[PDB]
Symmetry: C4
Subunit: 388 residues, 4 copies
């Protein structure tokens, strides 16, 4: 009821615990579950919810055939209660569109959806369930944004957007909203070469986004934002623990201000918590495919170009499929520090499990513990063969 302010620092991440899990495609085999992809989690002052881009069909309906494709008039951003499946009957539509981001500012929620053809797309910014601002395509080639939650600090919420090429120079802007209205915007600055899909968090009045260079880097771009001054910088993560996918095998020395060459024109959405000795990177286990997921503690990963892992945790075993991951935190929990959390998307169907005609996913989420807890692995758990 007054605007939230990033007042705390992160607690110390010594291991991760299960927070939420869906079992969406399992239950989906016999329930009216919606086909989704590009999920994320976001919290209000009184509840946290699971979010995704709907495809406008149930998994078992006939229109599910074809949902490998990313953009269409039948997609929407829906939220549903924590750890329940996206069900036709329990979801709330936030806005109509095929790219999105959302964050609550302490007083109410801002949601952003984008739709259009590839060359004549637009964003409309919803604040308190109503449309307030609308932005049009600047470079006329798939205007897109984060695909996970943004963060606010005393009313100002910055969002990162890219319009242009995913295979060479694009035009990225950082927009600063306050109550749904534009306060200012900046073109990208700093040394990062291409930005796609920022996964962001804040603490001690500073905002950190770990994004994806789709053009040429197996190491990830980092944008750091001042929300009072409204300025930013960008860099790449220095460490040789490369975290994008597909990617080359890990080196001995890394790169802070240039892409690491290896794979070109591809990638995945990912994240990291960067906090000096307390730094944890997440990544796929496969260097070739979106298979498995681990978390790795790599001290000073951002600055030390020779930093190697100190500790780890396996979240999905390499035989199972993962997909996109991103960061969130509940800024309204009691306690002295912010607890780090993340989700991982578990994609099922095409392109890897080609004997079905659909593509859907479930979610697993995790948050930090200061204890050293034992680990388990958290796979989707459906058997594709039941859908035949």
């Amino acid at each position: 009821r007054d605007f939230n302010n990033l007042t705390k620092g992160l607690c110390t991440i010594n291991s991760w615990h299960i927070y939420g899990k869906d079992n969406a495609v399992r239950i989906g085999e016999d329930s009216d579950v919606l086909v989704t992809r590009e999920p994320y989690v976001s919290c209000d002052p009184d509840e946290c919810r699971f979010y995704a881009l709907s495809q406008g069909t149930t998994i078992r309906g006939k229109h599910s055939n074809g949902t490998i494709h990313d953009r269409s008039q039948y997609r929407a951003l829906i939220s549903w209660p924590l750890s329940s499946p996206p069900t036709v009957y329990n979801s709330r539509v936030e806005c109509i569109g095929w790219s999105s981001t959302s964050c609550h500012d302490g007083k109410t929620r801002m949601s952003i959806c984008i739709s259009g053809p590839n060359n004549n797309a637009s964003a409309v910014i919803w604040y308190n369930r109503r449309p307030v601002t609308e932005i049009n395509t600047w470079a006329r080639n798939i205007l897109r944004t984060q695909e996970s939650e943004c963060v606010c600090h005393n009313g100002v919420c910055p969002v990162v957007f890219t319009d242009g090429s995913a295979t060479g120079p694009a035009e990225t802007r950082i927009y600063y909203f306050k109550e749904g209205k534009i306060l200012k915007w900046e073109p990208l600055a700093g040394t990062a070469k291409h930005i796609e899909e920022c996964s962001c968090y804040g603490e001690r009045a500073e905002i950190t986004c770990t994004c994806r260079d789709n053009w040429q880097g197996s190491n990830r771009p980092v944008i750091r934002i001042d929300p009072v001054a409204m300025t930013h910088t960008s860099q790449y993560i220095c460490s040789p623990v490369l975290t994008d996918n597909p990617r080359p095998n890990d080196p001995t020395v890394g790169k802070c201000n240039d892409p690491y060459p290896g794979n070109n024109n591809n990638g995945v959405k990912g994240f990291s918590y960067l906090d000096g000795v307390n730094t944890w990177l997440g990544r796929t286990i496969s260097i070739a495919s979106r298979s498995g997921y681990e978390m790795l503690k790599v001290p000073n990963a951002l600055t030390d170009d020779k930093s190697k892992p100190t500790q780890g945790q396996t979240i999905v075993l390499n035989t199972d499929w993962s997909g996109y991951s991103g960061s969130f935190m509940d800024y309204w929990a009691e306690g002295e520090c912010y607890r780090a959390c993340f989700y991982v998307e578990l994609i099922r169907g095409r392109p890897n499990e080609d004997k079905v005609w659909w593509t859907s996913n479930s979610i697993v989420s995790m948050c930090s513990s200061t204890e050293f807890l034992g680990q388990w692995d958290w796979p989707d758990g459906a058997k594709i063969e039941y859908f035949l």
Copy 2:
């Protein structure tokens, strides 16, 4: 919590953005979705909802066979959350009946449903979820009303009703309600020859309804209402951009106070925002069939009998089916002016897609932007062949 007053004027409509979309018949192929028709949208001070006349069946049930017919004992007015499908489990029944209108007055909602045989029909007016007033048929031939939201101004809400012939002179009355009770009623005055289905909005303490002459005019009737004085007038739209369907091809000169001859005994429910230079008309693209939908900016359309389009926007392409459209606005949004919005009904099944035995629809809604946004088209999206 005190009665709402039309205090503002319209913002400037420079283009339209997606507000809501259902994907109802797509999801309906495998979910418990109700068969509807004659939809509309209406807002409360804290939420906006989607509304329709139910048929009392799921699309995929066996009783769906036969729902081409308009009037029966199994129909009802239902509202459900914005952009969700009308589902057996998520809908709220407002009243029992086969014609309806509804509007919130700032303190609570008035809903009106009509039922009966053709010659012995009646309306009962619900205020705050309870029945308060009841009106009986005056001309004993299908007593009907708006099929979209009415509007109030400091407690008084006028509703337009026609009883009689749809193929020659009928008796139309304007009723003025305050808290569900009748304050006054008037027979139709002015030059309009036949009234059916008013689509209404208000601004600066004046109410505008664009209706359908089913008898003999391809140009539309307009009733303008003073809610303080409780009086009205009627006229036709002057412009040669004819907006009813079926209709003759557009002329060079139009008619302000007489019907334009061409098609007789037929039509569709439609709307317009009439605001001097800021005027936009909506219509089907086909002059013969309810196929496609466009919006056209036609300065001074109401008064200038030679007015031609200045700008446009395509909402449904001509290969797809549309059907009824109507106007709404959220009178309780923050900001200096009222934002114009509309819905379009996308009818599927009989009479055009004769290989199925049912008739249902979905909704698409749009609201104004002052920006010049790019366009996309918004078709229903189901494949009839999956229902065979």
Copy 3:
């Protein structure tokens, strides 16, 4: 928030309008609708709801075979929103049992359910969602009650119960509860010979119940209750318009203090509003079967043993099935007088439509209008053949 008091008299019933309708068995053919019977309606200060005794199955499930039988461990009293079908997902269970009654007292709701074997049954009285009092069988032969709403007056709510024979003398008691606790109880007094299923209402601090003599009368018993004094009397309705079913054809002269002979050992639950010149009786049209339903205005029906109809209204045509009916009113509506209302149960399945193995129903409800409205008939509307 203080106890409700019957302060008003009835308005003048000049005709009846639709209030609610279910279309339950229609929608039930393809939705998860529960098998019910013995329905009724009851209102709170802020909403009115539909109520019934569940069978513990969906209409289309396999356990529906056998639901002709009245008493079992799988039945429960459920309420759901007005004019929606009893759905597995939208119903609220009030208490577990095979006979019930319920009424709100201004502060909260009292619900009573009975279960057991035929000879060792018991009632438990729930007040504010919790169990408070429990009564055991006195005559050890199906302890039963109203099967519709009771009524309260400044906290005291009387309920009528019969334990014993349905084919000769039973023991009927009137119990007076206040906050779920027993204040007093009385054995039946007056001239009525057998009581089953009271359908009750109140006005001007007096309570009227019209019940069913299952032993030997085609004319109905009437109990009148003083809730301040906590006393009652009973009589039969004087008029020759016999309203039970099965029944003999109507006579010329009737009986005030004795049963009218004709049919023995059978009947149906029914009701009447008894208010001098303003008196309306409801009944089946068939004298042999539960088919059709009409309402008949019969001045002074209670006292004049020669009273004949003055006006009428048909609610279900004789070709369709009806079943039980009962009275309710919304005691918390605005206005000077109480509006009379009623429901009728539309039974489908065994014993009359023997080609299916289940028995279920839907509801139609109606309330008074002072206007003279036109009529329509309101049948269930399912086609049994779709269930084969």
Copy 4:
């Protein structure tokens, strides 16, 4: 809104009445009902709810094959409204895990779920819908807890946990939480030899848990807790009415401080209300199988090693299956004493009804009456043959 305090004593249990019943597997044959097991009931200050460990599937889906197994990544603790079935659409997830307990403290709810492999498991304690404390396995062999509600007294809520062998010495600890944080913990003391599954209640500021010795006793262990002093003791029940299953036939003399030999390495979760002359024990009727359930009044059962039944009540007949039972009470009901209540789990599927591939259950619950009520039996009621 201030912490609850166990201020009252128990009322006198003279017989038991139905409180809630599910009919879950009956309705499950044609509805989207979840596969559960290990149920229990727990109340808040304004409502009571039904709780269970989900399997992540609908009964009728294909992933139900295999749900005989107890631990996996697809299980979760869900609550749903009283006497409704656990439905995919109506359940709320409390936490992710395969062992659990929960209790409300007057201000909000604490929930505890455990997951992991058998040797590297962990608990995370949720308070007010958020994760607060996390405990790791101490003996590295299935860290488990109560499987029913815990109880609080002025903010402090003790929970009992066992880590280790279920077939010889394990390490049991009593933990005392206040607002989700650990205040203190104790290893087991007293004479009980092995603890599994405590079923607990409190009155007059003292907490009583009746548990299961899985190692070697047909008589049950009892832990009594002081929540102000935070200390406990343990004993076995003295009476020869043995209440575990499988068990030997009842003796003449019993044992207070040693296990009664007979069956080794097996058992079931059960409970008792121990209150001097007012003492009631519940048990399976079969000494060999989980079939039937009765309640038996056995004065001073805890202290008198020769105590025999005085009165009884049959809850499930011996031909039907039962399974786990446990205690609850609504500490926020009006009145002078606490009313005793219990649930019984009715297991259907494998291992006893081997012609299906799944294992699920329904619930029946009962609470005390001071009246002497008649009895009925409350079986699950599904027919397995409909699932073939």
